[PDB]
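Hi again,

Forgot to attach this to my earlier email, sorry! This is the prediction with AR6 bound. I've pasted everything inline since the attachment limit keeps bouncing my files.
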Amino acid sequence: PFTADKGKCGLPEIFDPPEELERKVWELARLVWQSSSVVFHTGAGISTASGIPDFRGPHGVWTMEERGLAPKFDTTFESARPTQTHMALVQLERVGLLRFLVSQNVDGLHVRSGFPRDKLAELHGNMFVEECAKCKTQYVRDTVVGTMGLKATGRLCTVACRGELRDTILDWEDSLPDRDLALADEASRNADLSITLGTSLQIRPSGNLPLATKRRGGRLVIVNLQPTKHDRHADLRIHGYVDEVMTRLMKHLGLEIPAWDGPRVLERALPPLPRPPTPKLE
Ligand SMILES: Nc1ncnc2c1ncn2[C@@H]1O[C@H](COP(=O)(O)OP(=O)(O)OC[C@H]2O[C@H](O)[C@H](O)[C@@H]2O)[C@@H](O)[C@H]1O
Ligand SMILES: Nc1cc(Cl)c(S(N)(=O)=O)cc1S(N)(=O)=O
Ligand SMILES: [Cl-]
Ligand SMILES: [Zn+2]
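Structure tokens for the complex follow:
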């Protein structure tokens, strides 16, 4: 924990100028239109505009620690609202343009946004989620589960079990959940487009999954203000605020970003809603 490798922290931000930013989000739209199977990979960068500081940005948890400063939260995890980017990802799944969502975020915001859990891999856990050791039944709580590191929460399974409920927050030494990692790897490998949003891609294996898309001629788009570990491997790197990128993209795709009704859990994805017809491309 103390010596744990926190990676490259506080690298300078890159800002694509407006003309170039506009061009690259139109190119992103084209890649989304052309793709049979789109997988999104999300990290701390997608929750910064809700007041949750990232890890390795200029004011990241780890960056600030490295300079002897403190991170600053503008929300609690319970009062955090899903961003435009979160709500855009809900809509893209609803209209069938998102096959799978792989997240490193423990903030519970994808679940609470109404994103279907059967299309979500939560690689590092979910702070609102506790799991029964005996029957592996998961409980999505309305409050943060008070422990980390897969500890006993003090609550017992209510399954028609009295099993010990434990948090789902990995500590440094913990293996990733095999179900989430298995499904994330399968999605990434079979995707012909992987789009990274607000991740520096420094954590193995989470950060390596988008590269798996590149096998058998898949395309990789990295959306990030800072450089990322796999920048060289990207077909497209967009240096801009993920909210500006996702709003411009939804506008290109002719989709509205849906209203957040407040914290809501959806276990299973629906058949796709209607979507606009595809533009002519070539
Ligand atoms: N609004 C924004 N728009 C675009 N990029 C942004 C924005 N805000 C931040 N960024 C970028 O978002 C990126 C966030 O990168 P990192 O902070 O490493 O977060 P991770 O998800 O990859 O951390 C992985 C794990 O590491 C931890 O130990 C935990 O275990 C994590 O789950 C930066 O490069 C920012 O430039
Ligand atoms: N950015 C961030 C910072 C912290 Cl400190 C935590 S944690 N360890 O308190 O869950 C979680 C996140 S996020 N939004 O990536 O889930
Ligand atoms: Cl909190
Ligand atoms: Zn149980």
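The beta strands are 38-42, 100-103, 120-122, 129-132, 138-140, 152-156, 164-167, 193-197, 219-223, 236-238. The first helix runs from residue 18 to 34.

That should be everything now.

G.
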